[PDB]
Design a protein around this ligand. Structure first.
Ligand SMILES: [Fe+3]
Lengths: 48, 136, 336, 48
């Protein structure tokens, strides 16, 4: 008939994962995925 | 030197520096009723639930300030099973017996209330990767 | 042995599609058809044309969309009509009083509140409202009352609000008025599709909602909106709404005249609380006053019911205004 | 112009594969793929 009011071209997937990096760690600097720097910084205490 | 595994159980020997559990309140001092080749029987422990002492060890003074320790295979009623036999145990000597921790989180908290120090990972993940094939 | 093995394995996700518990069926008003149908095809549409749409809420976070299945009447085989996304919705914590203009309302159990956008069209019960402001954290939004082809009405606490704008599943087939349909919504997940046997059923009766003319807008009596106190002379003001001119724009009751529609007039019914006494039709002005001639014949009417609607070619608006007002002044309520 | 009579959104692929699980086996219980239980049961004789 005509262009639909909206089209579902793709889905956005959300997951909540809990993981451990090993024994006690001092500082986490950056996260890299697929060759792209997702986040860079520094945290030294439990937080968000 | 690995000393690390991501399993459900505690992965810590009761009383170690990681469990941080004080066993002195749980110390029981008793004189055994009868000693056999493999079983040491006492009526005082008969008042505890089966398996209360399982995983614990028995220590008694040999000479001076030195004690000899023996682990317990199983505890059932008034009879205690000693790993490797009861040879060398004095029949009338004073014996100190400590309990044992199974390692399960329910066991850790209900009995000892040491859940905050629980070193095990009960339900964080068993296999779930983030690079698998199909999430569903 | 002493140690025991605890459960931890993989904890497989529980997809296991469930049937939809919250849902609704509606009739598409002219507002959407104006903005989704080209003028060339729209102008040829008869006044009796009707379209069907459905809204639903996600039962679980593991469901992405649902499939629409419908059939004509109570017999026949369902024909797939498409899939639609979940419609954000919420529950009213407090009653919404009858009052035009923006109103602040708090929502409870809100779902997908983040994706809501200002200017969208929201429908509750049988009233279409426009969102003016949004508070993500507290779920407080401002709603414009009496928009499009609807009029304000009392909504008790617990009424469901649907933000159907850009979140509705539409069946492109055209159905005439008076036909009863049976449709079901089937959830879709990565594990598969819900079996129809477990899907809830529902029925709707078409009424040519797009065909009927819009009712009057700004309804002010003696300079007051929905007043229970009028001092003597009765003055009622109404606004003229033309559906074609408005097109996809949402205009509330507070806005002034937007011109009339070709062949559209205003009709007013005067009742004595239960009985019909006078009826004035063919009104083309923006105000009407009770003629002095009938005041003595009907005498004092302390309890007066005002009914307002728009009619064209004998087509009455789906909704209408209705309130019982109390009169005060000389000769009215001197028992006190 | 208008919505096509039909749209080819995807293809369904069919393959016929012959494989061996090793030496003689007694019973096949289940098949698991991508973490989802495709089939569960038990067969002890040659059949479909
Ligand atoms: Fe412990």
């Amino acid at each position: 008939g005509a262009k639909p009011k909206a089209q579902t071209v793709g889905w956005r997937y959300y997951f909540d994962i809990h993981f451990a990096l090993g024994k006690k760690v001092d500082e986490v600097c950056a996260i890299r995925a697929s060759g792209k720097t997702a986040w860079k910084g520094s945290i030294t205490s439990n937080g968000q | 030197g690995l000393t690390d595994t991501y399993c459900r159980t505690c992965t810590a020997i009761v009383g170690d520096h990681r469990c941080k559990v004080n066993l002195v309140p749980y110390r029981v001092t008793l004189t055994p009723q009868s000693v056999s080749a493999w079983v040491i029987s006492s009526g005082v422990v008969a008042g505890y639930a089966d398996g209360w002492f399982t995983g614990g060890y028995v220590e008694w003074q040999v000479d001076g300030d030195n004690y000899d320790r023996r682990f317990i295979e199983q505890h059932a009623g008034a009879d205690l099973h000693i790993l490797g036999g009861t040879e060398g145990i004095p029949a009338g000597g004073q014996l100190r017996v400590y309990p044992g921790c199974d390692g399960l989180a329910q066991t850790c908290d209900d009995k000892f209330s040491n859940l905050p120090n629980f070193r095990g990972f009960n339900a964080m993940q068993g296999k779930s990767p983030f690079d698998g094939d199909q999430v569903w | 042995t002493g140690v025991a093995p605890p459960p931890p394995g993989w904890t497989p996700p529980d997809r296991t599609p469930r049937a939809i518990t919250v849902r609704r069926l509606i009739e598409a008003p002219y507002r959407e058809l104006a903005g989704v149908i080209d003028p060339a095809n729209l102008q040829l549409l008869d006044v009796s044309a009707s379209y069907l749409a459905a809204l639903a809420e996600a039962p679980t976070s593991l469901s992405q969309s649902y499939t629409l299945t419908d059939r004509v009447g109570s017999s026949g085989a369902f024909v797939d009509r498409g899939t639609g996304d979940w419609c954000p919705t919420g529950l009213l914590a407090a009653e919404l009083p009858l009052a035009a203009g923006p109103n602040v309302v708090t929502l409870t159990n809100a779902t997908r509140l983040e994706d809501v956008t200002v200017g969208q069209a929201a429908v509750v019960d049988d009233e279409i409202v426009r969102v003016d402001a949004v508070n993500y954290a507290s779920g407080t939004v401002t709603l414009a009352r009496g928009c499009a082809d609807t009029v304000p009405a009392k909504h008790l606490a617990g009424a469901r609000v649907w933000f159907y704008d850009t979140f509705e599943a539409v069946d492109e087939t055209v159905y005439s008025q008076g036909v009863t349909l049976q449709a079901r919504l089937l959830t879709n997940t990565s594990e598969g599709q819900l079996a129809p046997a477990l899907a809830a059923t529902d029925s709707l009766t078409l009424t040519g909602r797009q065909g009927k003319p819009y009712p009057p807008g700004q309804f002010r009596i003696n300079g007051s909106a929905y007043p229970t106190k009028v001092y003597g002379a009765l003055s009622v003001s109404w606004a003229k709404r033309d559906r074609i001119g408005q097109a996809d724009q949402l205009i509330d009751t507070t806005v002034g005249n937007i011109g009339p529609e070709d062949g559209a007039t205003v009709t007013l019914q005067v009742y004595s609380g239960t009985t019909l006494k006078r009826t004035y039709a063919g009104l083309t002005s923006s105000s009407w006053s009770y003629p002095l001639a009938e005041d003595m014949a009907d005498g004092p009417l302390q309890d007066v019911r005002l009914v307002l609607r728009s009619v064209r070619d004998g087509i009455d608006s789906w909704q209408q205004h209705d309130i019982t007002i109390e009169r005060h002044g000389l000769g009215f309520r001197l028992g006190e």
